[PDB]
Structure formats: structure tokens, C-alpha cells
């Protein structure tokens, strides 16, 4: 019944409309502290984040799950500052993404389990802020290290009850390998979200995972590089599929009877240093609504297509609550 | 004046200086996210204070911590241990072998601005300014490594702060690094070609010293007679004899000596710090306790050894 946020423990009824895969800043370990001028200043980034979260709140958002791990440069102090200023609950993450430094990548599965447990049970750094989710990743076939991370995440989830969420290359069907590794450790599918799943039109892959009890992360809805095909960097990140196509997968999974397995988000950020220089400016031009894209543009889109309000409320409120609750 | 973690110091205050050392070899943000890996931050700090105090009692007055952003440099820890041990510590900027995505995707102009920020403004929100730029290559330089060496040269040219390198001495890296630094217009007197004691080729070292380069004979205690691939198969005496060999060639003023020691090591296998502590119990005190008396026994005078340990580092670190 209680989940950990950057402001402390809250009850699941307080969570409300929740965006399950978001970021305040997409960076690297220690980067924001060492070079805040990359984002203008730390103050400029904080103010931009507060404006965006306040706009999201006005649109209906009550909670966002910041899936930024240590290697994505998660700065919990920044998350706490912006959460309080915008009055939007933010759930922090532990885990490891695809840029682990030497001190992380040379560790055993036992050592990684203890790190994840430290961030969930004790706290992140010296802040006392506890992680409420574990973020892991693969991009195609898992490397020997990525396999250890998935196993460590599963062991950390089994000891705490906190969920696991993933980054995938949906086109390569990564969810199947991830799922197999999680189950080999005894982890329940109901504790896992196979993210970036809206990057494929293969409904057979999505429904099969949904049938096993997995939560499906249709989390990059505003990602579209239509209009900017001359920009190779933006095209590789955002893709050539429209927001409408990504959004119709929510309808397709409801129509197949898997409304309870759907998690929706924007995968948005206010700062982005782990990619090419002016990517944040390009992204803000594509989607000016930012994190508010789901309640403002996606929810009314699905309403006119025939999806009931109680099903949409069930996806945005009930599903994240069941997912985030420690069991 | 040379910038330290406790503020500016004059050239005369530097004294006996170890030019390539580390308080902790880690990764960006690692020490603050998982201090329990080292026992605790308090335990690491206490071990560092004892090791620096031991080096101080052996004659050392200043150490240059060449730990970069990606080696997990924590300047606030460096400042704490420096105060407690009464040893000056010069912090570093630059990039090593483990840059994260936010660093490795940057242009030469952006990396120059980062290095400049750490030298001119300060490191993080501490106000502590770097007094040396650390860079690295393993064999033939990768496209990104070339960008870093160029950004390092440009940061040095705008500030007067020196550049120190990590090399794969067996693959003759110093020659390529030298060509890149020179193409940028950087004076050889502002560059130290480090890890140069890992080779038996004297002709390579003398040729670089003739061009005006400072030779970093900095891994003297490294001997393994995963632990064998890091320390090497050669003895400390063989590495120490290279100092004498370069003095005999008339390049006394071009030599910089150090230990390349640390008190915490997380960027390698789990129990490597314990393995390293058995091999060399002297730690950072290895140079004044074992290397200097060894050289005095081989016929090297005191004024020459004082020239290598006091005069050369002071001239190298002094912003020119
Ligand atoms: Co992702
Ligand atoms: Co994301
Ligand atoms: Co080195
Ligand atoms: Co070193």
C-alpha cells in the first residue's frame, strides 16, 4: 500500500495519474555536478523542469516515475527539488542502464544485488531517498554483463517487492530474452514492465508477453522524426513512426483484452547530455507539450476512437498503482 | 602560483613532489553512490590520511592527484585528506579510458570548454581549480582519444597548466601523442609522457627528452614477481635503473618520478587493493624510502635527486 518517492513514503491512492517512464535529465554519472553549464546552469535546468512538471500537473499528471539510473546520471537532489516545487510525486530508480562505468561493469551479480538493495532499503547516496523501481536495459541480444544486471535486478525485486522496468529494442524482440532471464530467477511477470514496446507493430510479440502477466510499456508515444528526415541523429532516436501509430497500440492491446497490462508514458526529459549536442531543442520542437502530451493529446485521441474513459483511467491510474505497490 | 585543493601555493612551498598519484581510482559518482565498496567513506579517508602522513614523514610535501572526472575524482575528499595529513594535493582535469556517453559524444570545442571550466572556474561547486590536465591512449589513438589530446593542448595553451599522459610504453604511444601536441602548437616543456618506465627501449625515451618532453617514470613499485596484466613482469630495480640511465644521457631536468599509487581501487577487480598493498607496503612512500636510496648507492648525487624531486615538478606545474 506504500511506495517510496523523493519526498518520502506515500500511499497508492495519492499516486493518481502516473507516467511510468520519464526523466528529469538524461545524462551520465556525475555529469550534472561537474558541468552544469552544459544545460545553461543547474538553476536553468531546475526551472525548466518545474515549468514542465507544473504544466503536466495542470493537465492531470500527479506522479511520474523517473527511471534514471546511476549511469543515466540520476541526481536525486534535483528530483527532490523539482518534485517539491511542482508538487508532483517523483519515484526514483536504481538499476543500471547501458553505460555502466568500469567500477560497475567489473562487478559480480552478488555485488550488483547489494548495490540495488542499498538504493532501495537504505537510500541513494547520503540523501535517505529510496528507489521505488529498478531500471535495466538491453539493445538486441544481451551482453554477459547485461545478463548479470537482469539477474541482480530480479534478486533485488524478490527481496523487496519493488518492480523492474526495462529499456528494449522492440524491433529485436528483447522482451522475450529479458522475460526468460527474469523467470529463471523466479521473478513474477507482474513485477516487470517491458518498456519501449511501442516501437514495434508486431502485435503477436506484445500480446504474448501481456498473456504471461507482463506489463507492456508503450512509453515513447511522442517520439516521431516525421518532418526532420534530413537529421540523421534525430531520426535514429525518435524513429519514422508517427505518434498516432504508437498510440493505436494502446487501443490494439485493449481490443485484445489486455487493458490491465498497459503502461503509458512519454520518455521525456528536460535535459539530455547522453546524445548529440542540440537534441533537447529538436525534441522540444517536435513535442512542445512535453510530459503533458499523454493527457492533452493521447487521451482525447483514444476517446474519439472508441476507448471508454474508465478504461483510460484504469491504464493511467489503476495499472501503475498495482505495478508500483511492493508485493 | 600552483592551485591545490586547499587554495593557491607558491613554487617554493611545493617541495618534494610526486607527480602521478591517486587518492582513489574509481568512476564518476561511484564513491558517493556506493561508499560501502571501500568499507565506508570514513574508512577510505582514514586510510588516505595515514598513507599521506607516511609519505610526508618520508619527505613528500606535495602529491599531484591525476584522477580525472571519469577516474571518480572527489575533490572534497582530496581537500579533507590534504588538511588532515598536511600534504598539498594538486587536482586534475582531463579524461581517461572510461568516459561516459555525455563525454564521449562531445566535440573538441566542448571538451576544451569543460577542461577550461575545471582550471579557470573550479571543479563542481567547490571552487577548487585543477592544476594539471590528465589524458590517455592505449596503443594507436582512437578518434575520440585524439579529440581529448587536442582539447587538452588547447586548455593548456589558454591557461599555462601542464599536460600529463598515460601511455602503453610497449606500443611506443609517446611518439604519436607528441605529434598531436606539436600540431596544436603546444610546447613539449608543458607535457609529461607518463608510464614510460614500462619499456626497456632507452632510445625512445632519450629522443623524446631531446625534443623537450618530460619523461614520466611513474610506475616504479609495479611488479608481479588480472594482477599480472596490471603490474607487469618486470622488477622495480629495472624500472628504477631507467632514472639513472636518463641522467647519464644528460636529461636530468626532463625526469619526473612517482608511484602511481592509490588507497582505493574500484575500477578493477574486487580485491585488487589488498593485492597491491602486499606487493608495496610502503605505498606512496616507495619513492623516497626505496628508489632514492637505491639511486644514491648507484652513484647518483643528492643535488641531482633533489633536482628531479623538487626542481623539475615545480617548473612543470608552474603556470607558464
Ligand atoms: Co530507454
Ligand atoms: Co527513458
Ligand atoms: Co594510468
Ligand atoms: Co594513474
Curated annotation (Swiss-Prot), chain B:
InterPro entries on file: AryldialkylPase_Zn-BS, Metal_Hydrolase, Phosphotriesterase, TAT_signal
Catalytically driven reaction(s): An aryl dialkyl phosphate + H2O = dialkyl phosphate + an aryl alcohol
Protein localization: Cell membrane
Gene3D superfamilies the record matches: Metal-dependent hydrolases
Co-factor binding comment: Binds 2 Zn(2+) ions per subunit.
Function: Has an unusual substrate specificity for synthetic organophosphate triesters and phosphorofluoridates. All of the phosphate triesters found to be substrates are synthetic compounds. The identity of any naturally occurring substrate for the enzyme is unknown. Has no detectable activity with phosphate monoesters or diesters and no activity as an esterase or protease. It catalyzes the hydrolysis of the insecticide paraoxon at a rate approaching the diffusion limit and thus appears to be optimally evolved for utilizing this synthetic substrate.
Oligomeric and partner information: Homodimer.
Protein name: Parathion hydrolase
Organism (species): Brevundimonas diminuta
Organismal lineage: Bacteria, Pseudomonadati, Pseudomonadota, Alphaproteobacteria, Caulobacterales
Gene symbol of the encoding locus: opd
Amino acid at each position: 500500500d506504500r511506495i517510496n518517492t523523493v519526498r518520502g513514503p506515500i500511499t497508492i491512492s495519492e499516486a493518481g495519474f502516473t507516467l511510468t517512464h520519464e526523466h528529469i535529465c538524461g545524462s551520465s554519472a556525475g555529469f550534472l555536478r561537474a558541468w552544469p553549464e552544459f544545460f545553461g546552469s543547474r538553476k536553468a535546468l531546475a526551472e525548466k523542469a518545474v515549468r514542465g512538471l507544473r504544466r503536466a500537473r495542470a493537465a492531470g499528471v500527479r506522479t511520474i516515475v523517473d527511471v534514471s539510473t546511476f549511469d543515466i546520471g540520476r541526481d536525486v537532489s534535483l528530483l527532490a527539488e523539482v518534485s517539491r516545487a511542482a508538487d508532483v510525486h517523483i519515484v526514483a530508480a536504481t538499476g543500471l542502464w547501458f553505460d555502466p562505468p568500469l567500477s560497475m561493469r567489473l562487478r559480480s551479480v552478488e555485488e550488483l544485488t547489494q548495490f540495488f538493495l542499498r538504493e532501495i532499503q537504505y537510500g541513494i547516496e547520503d540523501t535517505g531517498i529510496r528507489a521505488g523501481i529498478i531500471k535495466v536495459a538491453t539493445t538486441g541480444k544481451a551482453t554477459p554483463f547485461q545478463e548479470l544486471v537482469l539477474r541482480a535486478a530480479a534478486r533485488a525485486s524478490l527481496a523487496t517487492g519493488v518492480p523492474v522496468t526495462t529499456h528494449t529494442a522492440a524491433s529485436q524482440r528483447d522482451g522475450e530474452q529479458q522475460a526468460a532471464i527474469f523467470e529463471s530467477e523466479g521473478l513474477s511477470p507482474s513485477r516487470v514492465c517491458i518498456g519501449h514496446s511501442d516501437d514495434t507493430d508486431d502485435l503477436s510479440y506484445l500480446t504474448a508477453l501481456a498473456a504471461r502477466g507482463y506489463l507492456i510499456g508503450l512509453d515513447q508515444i511522442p517520439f516521431s522524426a516525421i518532418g526532420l528526415e534530413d537529421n540523421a541523429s534525430a531520426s535514429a532516436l525518435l524513429g519514422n513512426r508517427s505518434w498516432q501509430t504508437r498510440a493505436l497500440l494502446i487501443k490494439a492491446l485493449i481490443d485484445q483484452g489486455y487493458m490491465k497490462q498497459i503502461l503509458v508514458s512519454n520518455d521525456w526529459l528536460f535535459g539530455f547530455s547522453s546524445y548529440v549536442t542540440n537534441i533537447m531543442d529538436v525534441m522540444d520542437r517536435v513535442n512542445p507539450d512535453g510530459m503533458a502530451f499523454i493527457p492533452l493529446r493521447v487521451i482525447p485521441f483514444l476517446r474519439e476512437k472508441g476507448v471508454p474513459q474508465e478504461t483510460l483511467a484504469g491504464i493511467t491510474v489503476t495499472n501503475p498503482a498495482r505495478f508500483l505497490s511492493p508485493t
